[model samples]
Target chain A: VVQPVIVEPIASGQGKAIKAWTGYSVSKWTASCAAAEAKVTSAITISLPNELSSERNKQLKVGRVLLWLGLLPSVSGTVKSCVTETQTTAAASFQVALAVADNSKDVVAAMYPEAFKGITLEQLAADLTIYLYSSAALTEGDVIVHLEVEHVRPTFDDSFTPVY
Target chain B: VVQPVIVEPIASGQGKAIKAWTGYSVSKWTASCAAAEAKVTSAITISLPNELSSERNKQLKVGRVLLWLGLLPSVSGTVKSCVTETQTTAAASFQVALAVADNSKDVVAAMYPEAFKGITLEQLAADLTIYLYSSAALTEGDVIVHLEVEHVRPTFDDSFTPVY
Candidate 1:
């Protein structure tokens, strides 16, 4: 029996953009990114916990460093992210990022100056990084950081029609 | 039980252009487009009084196919078109455009020098054309002609209203 079909229209993929995945929580969420292009397409960011002043070298509280894995698949030719930040606090708001094909395989090459004193998110780092570093302290406070990224690729509507 | 109604997807179909539709006093309407693509499912055309110009020299009143119907497919798979014409009543009116696809589509082959005398939309030749060649003549009056073209393939939902 022949019947009529009713379907809603899908996106035409216009006026749209992609954002990157992330993770950085000295408090809540974190983020990261990596890209190469003429203009700024993709980006990543990080936000820490309390306001940690200058050098205070130390490692994560154990459950950290691994938060980058729980983020979404938003990282490639399939469907991902192109971050958008909106925070206004006068503290240590820094940056961190990474390069990837899928969401694995990468390294952190320490660029520029040294990481000998206590730090806050108020700075920036290259590639996948440990944004807030110090000279290693015994009594470390909550080190919070947020990470994210945004990128641009092709866009269009994947419309469908019956061949009948 | 509720039965499903099957239907086709309509293009919100934005990204279309609205050119100033017009025709010269020679009583002819014309249009042109020089894009690089295939699958001519769409068209750009003119309105004429002597229906004959529509279908192979047969009077339009008899209802013949407008030449636009016989034209070729020139729309692409992925596309974006924008036109920027510069000229004031002070200078000679002119136009230029860009569909800006993958940066590998087209270039002009030259249409004409100047829209000189005895040109009442009839002696239509190349590039910028009078899709509907003329059927008249008169004093060198100010002829109003609208310029535009519609690509094919993914027809947008922003087509103009019919004036036939």
Candidate 2:
């Protein structure tokens, strides 16, 4: 007698969704105002949490990223500051990107300042690092980032597909 | 003996992922140069596509929103304009937002210029409206918007959840 086999589809482990992550909380990475290219590298790594890391096809993807030009020693804000300080000349001179762990890595996300769109939903298959390069010494304050992330199918694309 | 019942979880209806949705397509909404606070209201309303609206718990959540302070007339541009025109004093004077219909409506996404974050994933149980306001007459050009939306759990939070 011949036996038939059936396989079940794998389940995704990511349950809780992250609304947003800010440097003041989840990330300890900060940029030094050094003029050298890639002068500053992140001390920490970011990846999917183990609890949400069950499916092999699931990976962390970047969403909306807002880089605040100033820093808060213990969390502070007013929408007024975000509007006033972000458009000044000082905010345009700074740039940052996401890359791999070593010098042999590729630029996963190119350098951008203030607000950006060059790295939306890009995957973080493994631990990734943050690199900072500034054209001139940052005169506003230290740069901190607000990142929105989600654990989704690794192939999620950010390009628009027509709805005809 | 009574038979035990097993229930299956409802499947998410959205399959073909829409990476991004721009004003040139999908939305027929445009703002007028009129000075009235809500001078111009959207001609069309936005809702989840039938193919993506199978489950009641699934609704469209906004991601990143970028408003270009110029017109395409028939689709046009270069990085030069996005960089050069977006920062000039002209770009700072324009403001736009997403709002509900009728005079008794609330500001769903507050007014912002150039780019914004005031209306990410705020639900659209029904059709929603857009409003435009300007500090002064727009000198650069007509305003167009770029929106990113996804069908997901209605309660999907963009807030960071700590991992220990």
Candidate 3:
């Protein structure tokens, strides 16, 4: 006698609930990311916030952020004659540039006489994070698939101590 | 109205004590700096007690330290020279280099795909602090005259979060 195998299918209602929850969580996270990016960009033009300052050194930390966004064109397809079908697809991309001034604002002028001092690439990354949160350019529905930060400079003085 | 000016001569015993302390501090600091430099150099090498990992990513972080140290000899001395002769006359010069390898360790490979990830030029700077302390290279007497770290290869990927 041969035995019959049975496989149970996932319920449609449970599948829908899981999908909805995942989408909602992703949306919330992406929204936060976008807002953070915006805040940093705007703050840089005016004055850096107080949170980034170092207690040991009384100086403003300057930072920069670069933002990029891309979208793929929607596509539709149809089979001819015997069978017909249609499909649509879209994609998006983003990038950010950031710069940060370090804690030794006073020492910068004295130490890196020729260049900027007390500024670090890491602080730049932090600035980028802040900008993403503050910016209003992103829509609530938009997804942030990829994020990266490149430190163009580092914060230090002639003394090698961390400025930020 | 008339103003009075006051001057006091140094006490013989106090003067001698100060001089002795100054000499002791300078010597201790110089030794500390030299020791720190040596350990950093060894960390970049392949055969030393602090040898960098064989993985490409791990190697890159080590390479950054080496590169920074390589340029230090030329730039650091000049910076030191700008200070009073009292500072540079007794200073010691230091240098470091890096060694390469094919495959990285499993831990390193897990962190980075083809190369190590999360090792930024900035993180490398922090790592240097660890190396300095690990080797007992720093002393309270040592005054850091001049130190600078520059990223020669800006094209490399940065995966680490910046420290505040």
Candidate 4:
């Protein structure tokens, strides 16, 4: 179990401040198109002109992924992913891209008593694999599938959770 | 309370149909970009290609309005609208557009036994104003806002609600 690092403690010490939190990223996205009649597989890109930073090594926790098929159209397309191989052929495939932080080591140490069982961010990312599936062949008239992802900064208000 | 009419039932009738269920439209678009710091007052437009026929003279129940401000950035912006006026200077104005359905008597019959207390879609649209506000001065370096909306047809399996 690994977690992102906390940026800095707030002045009043109510909560730590993050350049961008996973909750922040999560809130910005959460949309879906109609269902696709054809098989769809493509790279899903999201832009947060108001949130995500350009720096590559930035830290974030990936909460959810886009699974192309299980999403129901009538549900307004905000369906959670359920991987499969037919109408079920849809499956999710993506590595949770992230890096553990220096300050994070502090929170990590606090969360899991077994801090010594940890690996460096590089080592963890080397095997970071988040499964996700997407629809590629949606038509202009067909229902477009929306791939939703929730990114947020880590917090220590409670015990920190890990992606591993 | 008002509700749109359900289109002709599907052949097998296992489930109801929709031109653009939430999932169908969700796939059409999901974008993110580096942070932005500016005033954003754009009228959000949504189209239902899958369910909504291109032909006019059609009818639908207004599911929800994309109130530009009720959404919280740290929250995936799916926040439903609550009308107001100071921050209320921010408004989403429409033409109060819509013609009553032929099957609908040019207006819906009342749901409550107290029919006189009801409102029609057109009448509601005329006063259907939903107020809102957004962060006008987010910093360029801060997490930017992501405006998200989801629209869908309703079903009667449960105690479904209406826009009116």
Candidate 5:
């Protein structure tokens, strides 16, 4: 039988926020698969960094922007079945996602406050769709895997924010 | 513009067969992508050990098998894109393979006596589709990314002979 391996995040504070966001994103996708009664053999969670020096922050901000704009390489991976008995069919799935988070002030607050002020979360989300398509074209991989995302919600709780 | 990184195998008489086989696998994939007009941005060649003690050989074999099956985690630093006046798009592709030597009466020779038994040149190629898929699934984390892959020859060489 397939088993679930629970992985705890290593980074706390802002790191926790990153982990939470990644978990939230993955859950949204897994939920659909569960709803479809598809067997999932494994799941993974990944957290991006937050809060950096202005220069590094700028680079991170730009990466996020490009991802939002659909101009960068996104997520990519392989998927296959878990059955071990005699199986006539054997195939795998591949996926890529250009953007997962928005470029809103709350999202970019710790990274690019000045630029974040002018951008709305909605606009960033729209740009992310474009970025996803652009990234797919650039990566030149397959489009079999789909993505589900959660909107970035800003909070005053220090627990949700990464420590600089 | 895209650039190519060249990797030459270290001609250690001991592990030459394994190295050559892995390299050939990568080269075949590169050729496949080129045929389809897919740009290859990066490539890596992984070599294996030869003449190890039975235990060591088993470990090496298992490790190589795991790698081919995608049970290892590869790490990466930050990734970004070039900035333009307007928005721009970019993509990255990486290829990895194993190699074996032609003249060597090494593992390849022991594994398949009929084919290599007669051939003089080192034979090299990527693993089978199922093997590659298994290996790719073993990656984890945000620092770890899995790209798509195209398999050329599904099973063993045209001769239908196994490689050691």
Candidate 6:
């Protein structure tokens, strides 16, 4: 069987370099609140570390974000399962954002469930801050938030050469 | 017209080297229990071999942890997808912690749902023990735990650094 297809020239070297840099390294951060913790009205912002924040040109690539809400009393040894739509709907209500500091910034990543794994396709700075917001208090189980990022620097420098 | 921003001398050299080492390789481990089996009270700990544990400085970077709680009977050609918060919530409850041997050590990683995929931002040594605990026994489906880690040594030593 034959099929008609169109061909186009591709920048192979540059694409490879971008992929290498994007998946270069991963940085992780977390925020959590236990059962009975008071609801947070303000955004719980976390600052990036020296190695992750010092660079300006370096970009923070998205990996994935996970939010786990424990609805039952976390008794030691008792493993629970996430099985209901109501639970996830409530968990999704918690918001997370990626932004810059005092000078100026933009919302790079947020809990946009429609996006694959609740992350945006943006090249944010490594120095960006992470903000977690909860509209309600945890009367039952608990809440946990996780963010995975990679600092990427796509430059045509001596350190990186064309694949060709 | 715009003035040039003074970007500090970033560790371009070391960043490349570390990137090469960080994505050097991926290691995967899995643990499971059948639905028929009674609930386990003691910790089901797994040990690492010499190649993985000998080097203390070698870091075990987190990749992803997939907890598959098989609520239904396992049969061939059954390609079940991970859906629903109730299932995930129960799966998340299955505690997975990485620690050391009989000697003194810290909790390198745990099911802290908020730390970017239930993993910590710390550079944990590869020679850690994996402890799986389930407080309640399984009455229906089985439980499977998968852990993906990368062994990284970000050193300027001759063995790792490219021969210049």
Best by TM-score: 6
Candidate 4 residues lying further than 4 Å off, grouped into runs, are A1-25, A30-37, A46-49, A54-58, A64-137, A144-150, A153-164, B1-164
Indicate the worst ten consecutive residues by lDDT in candidate 3 chain A.
A78-87
How much is the lDDT of residue A91 in candidate 4?
A: 29
Clashes of each: 67, 6, 38, 57, 26, 21
Misplaced by over 4 Å in model 3 are A1-127, A130-164, B1-118, B130-141, B145-150, B153-164
C-alpha local distance difference test of each model: 0.25, 0.30, 0.23, 0.28, 0.22, 0.32
Sliding window of 10 residues with minimal summed lDDT for model 4 chain A: A108-117
For candidate 1, the TM-score is 0.15
Native contact fraction per model: 0.00, 0.00, 0.00, 0.00, 0.00, 0.00
Supply the global lDDT for candidate 5.
0.22
Q: After superposition, how far is residue A29 of candidate 1 from its true place, in Å?
A: 2.7
Model 1, range A38-136, lDDT digits (tens) per residue? 222233344333322223312221111222222232322221221112213211223211211212233211111111111222322311223222222
Scanning candidate 5 chain A in windows of ten residues, the lowest lDDT window is: A28-37
Error at A17, model 2, angstroms: 34
Task: Locate the minimum summed-lDDT window of 10 residues in model 1 chain B.
Answer: B59-68
**If you assessed candidate 3 against the hidden native complex, which CAPRI class would it receive?**
incorrect
lDDT of 3 at B93: 20
Candidate 3, residue B41: CA error in Å? 18
Per-residue accuracy of model 6 over B1-164 as CA lDDT, tens digit each:
99989977765344332122334444445545333323332222333434455343333434433223222344322121121112223333222222111111121222212122212213222112233333334532344534444444324232653586
Candidate 2, pairs of clashing residues: A19-B157, A19-B158, A19-B159, A20-B158, A20-B159, B62-B121
